[PDB]
Amino acid sequence: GAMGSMERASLIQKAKLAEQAERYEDMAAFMKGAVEKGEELSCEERNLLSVAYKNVVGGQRAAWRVLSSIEQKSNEEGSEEKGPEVREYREKVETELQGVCDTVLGLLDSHLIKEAGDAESRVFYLKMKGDYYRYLAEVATGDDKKRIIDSARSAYQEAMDISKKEMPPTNPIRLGLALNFSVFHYEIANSPEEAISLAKTTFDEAMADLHTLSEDSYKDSTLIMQLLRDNLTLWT
């Protein structure tokens, strides 16, 4: 890799600079280089990895949705033939997005997940695995879409099982996992009732545990709880 010659600490430092400069492709390349040093990642470093790739894939997803919409309009009754260009360009963006998802999944498989023993690291990485399979599912058609959906589900479910046994109901990693699994149910798996039930139960169990928290932890947990509530308002 092009980052093989740079010190691990320098890659981390530069990822933080790239974040400040809103250079998320650079940030992701630096964090990929850091992962490939082979050492486990601290909490802060896991968060840098996630921020970098979420921002990269976020731009790709937004672009894909714009293009896919134009393409669907182009395939309506009464629309003019404009050639293969819309499809080609949507496919170009789609392929780049799938490449980023495959890169992230490859880092998780080689070897972040297998070395992650603490609940906070293991749940974080399994949630990431579910998320990037979910992003693949958003663009999937044809004969592997069911398997991609099942891969997302399986990762989220393993993360949920650990989180419920090992973390309090207000833990922000647990909350963000449940939030994203509920989105999977609603948006990917055609299971809106499951999504609503999960969001409700997650919110209520967190509410009942807020009394145990410091002011700063209360702010972290309630921020994610509000996202659960926002989705419930959208979905009901």
Binding site: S50, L179, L234
Partner: peptide, 10 residues
Amino acid sequence: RSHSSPASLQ
């Protein structure tokens, strides 16, 4: 669109 988690969690 549904809201998903922020990238940074503690």
